[PDB]
Design an enzyme around this catalytic site. Structure first.
Site, mmCIF file in Angstrom:
data_model
loop_
_atom_site.group_PDB
_atom_site.id
_atom_site.type_symbol
_atom_site.label_atom_id
_atom_site.label_comp_id
_atom_site.label_asym_id
_atom_site.label_seq_id
_atom_site.Cartn_x
_atom_site.Cartn_y
_atom_site.Cartn_z
ATOM 1 N N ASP A 174 -6.292 6.104 -4.583
ATOM 2 C CA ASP A 174 -5.963 4.814 -4.776
ATOM 3 C C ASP A 174 -5.790 4.256 -6.364
ATOM 4 O O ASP A 174 -6.029 5.055 -7.047
ATOM 5 C CB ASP A 174 -6.733 3.745 -3.661
ATOM 6 C CG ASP A 174 -7.920 3.475 -4.460
ATOM 7 O OD1 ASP A 174 -8.643 3.850 -5.293
ATOM 8 O OD2 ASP A 174 -8.836 2.983 -3.554
ATOM 9 N N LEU A 225 -9.049 3.945 2.935
ATOM 10 C CA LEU A 225 -9.916 4.398 1.750
ATOM 11 C C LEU A 225 -10.689 5.561 2.419
ATOM 12 O O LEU A 225 -11.338 5.132 3.614
ATOM 13 C CB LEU A 225 -10.662 3.290 1.299
ATOM 14 C CG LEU A 225 -11.889 3.807 0.354
ATOM 15 C CD1 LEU A 225 -11.393 4.176 -1.005
ATOM 16 C CD2 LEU A 225 -12.738 2.336 0.044
ATOM 17 N N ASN A 275 -6.828 -20.345 -9.829
ATOM 18 C CA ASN A 275 -8.183 -19.829 -9.935
ATOM 19 C C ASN A 275 -8.093 -18.280 -9.357
ATOM 20 O O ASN A 275 -8.809 -17.467 -9.940
ATOM 21 C CB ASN A 275 -8.984 -20.459 -8.903
ATOM 22 C CG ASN A 275 -10.593 -20.366 -8.927
ATOM 23 O OD1 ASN A 275 -10.819 -19.341 -8.127
ATOM 24 N ND2 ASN A 275 -11.324 -20.925 -10.038
ATOM 25 N N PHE A 319 -8.494 -6.674 3.075
ATOM 26 C CA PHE A 319 -7.843 -5.036 3.170
ATOM 27 C C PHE A 319 -8.100 -4.436 1.841
ATOM 28 O O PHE A 319 -8.412 -3.120 1.862
ATOM 29 C CB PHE A 319 -6.375 -5.011 3.511
ATOM 30 C CG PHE A 319 -5.801 -3.528 4.042
ATOM 31 C CD1 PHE A 319 -5.516 -2.780 3.186
ATOM 32 C CD2 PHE A 319 -5.880 -3.259 5.677
ATOM 33 C CE1 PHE A 319 -5.189 -1.508 3.592
ATOM 34 C CE2 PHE A 319 -5.384 -2.081 5.818
ATOM 35 C CZ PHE A 319 -4.798 -1.133 4.936
ATOM 36 N N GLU A 341 0.839 -1.308 -0.032
ATOM 37 C CA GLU A 341 -0.108 -0.055 -0.052
ATOM 38 C C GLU A 341 0.822 1.308 -0.044
ATOM 39 O O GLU A 341 0.463 2.401 -0.321
ATOM 40 C CB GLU A 341 -0.949 -0.122 1.066
ATOM 41 C CG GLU A 341 -2.039 -1.189 1.145
ATOM 42 C CD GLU A 341 -3.173 -1.098 0.066
ATOM 43 O OE1 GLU A 341 -3.122 -0.168 -0.489
ATOM 44 O OE2 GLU A 341 -3.936 -2.085 0.031
ATOM 45 N N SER A 390 -12.184 -20.299 -5.536
ATOM 46 C CA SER A 390 -10.572 -20.211 -4.865
ATOM 47 C C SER A 390 -10.663 -20.547 -3.168
ATOM 48 O O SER A 390 -9.723 -21.326 -3.080
ATOM 49 C CB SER A 390 -10.510 -18.672 -4.901
ATOM 50 O OG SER A 390 -9.659 -18.467 -6.263
#
Ligand SMILES: Fc1cc(F)c(F)c(F)c1F
Ligand SMILES: [Cl-]
Length: 164
Positions: free
Chosen positions: A20, A32, A132, A104, A11, A117
């Site tokens: 972002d 965010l 996947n 996150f 990040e 998945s």
């Protein structure tokens, strides 16, 4: 390496409001603020998050405070989700970090399409799971980061974050 160091790599750290990868107003370590295109709406959210009138800039301490809260919120989100909790419980600590990383970035609603998945991860079919996971908007939009997270799920090691 750990979830905090991992997400710090993925990040970055920016002390002033920025957009972002999706174009949304954000601050600190991928916190965010809003999906609104209004900068004033973003600054308002920031003030509310920090508890003071900031006008767009925070300290490193404040960034890390929000970061800890956000990591906490992701873990708590996983544990309260009936679809995510069993898969998360089934994983070793390294792959748990990979899970927190995903939540996150995209939230529980973002990980909702990852049913197959999730099943493969719970079955410990690592290579199949990895294949996947890459079949996703997530991988296509943020390939380098997704590749790191997927390698973490595939190997149960921190190899993708070494030398970073
Ligand atoms: F939210 C999650 C995302 C993943 F990719 C997982 F494997 C998981 F267990 C989980 F709880
Ligand atoms: Cl600003």
């Amino acid at each position: 390496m750990n979830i905090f160091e991992m997400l710090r790599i993925d990040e970055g750290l920016r002390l002033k409001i920025y957009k972002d990868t999706e174009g949304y107003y954000t601050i600190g370590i991928g916190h965010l603020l809003t999906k609104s295109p209004s900068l004033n709406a973003a600054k308002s959210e920031l003030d509310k998050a920090i508890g003071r009138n900031t006008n767009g800039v925070i300290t490193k301490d404040e960034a890390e405070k929000l970061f800890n809260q956000d990591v906490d919120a992701a873990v708590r989100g996983i544990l309260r989700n009936a679809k995510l909790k069993p898969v998360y419980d089934s994983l070793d600590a390294v792959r748990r970090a990979a899970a927190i990383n995903m939540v996150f970035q995209m939230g529980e609603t973002g990980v909702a399409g990852f049913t197959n998945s999730l099943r493969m991860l719970q079955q410990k079919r690592w290579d199949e799971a990895a294949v996947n996971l890459a079949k996703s908007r997530w991988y296509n939009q943020t390939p380098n980061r997704a590749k790191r997270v997927i390698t973490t799920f595939r190997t149960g090691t921190w190899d993708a974050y070494k030398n970073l």
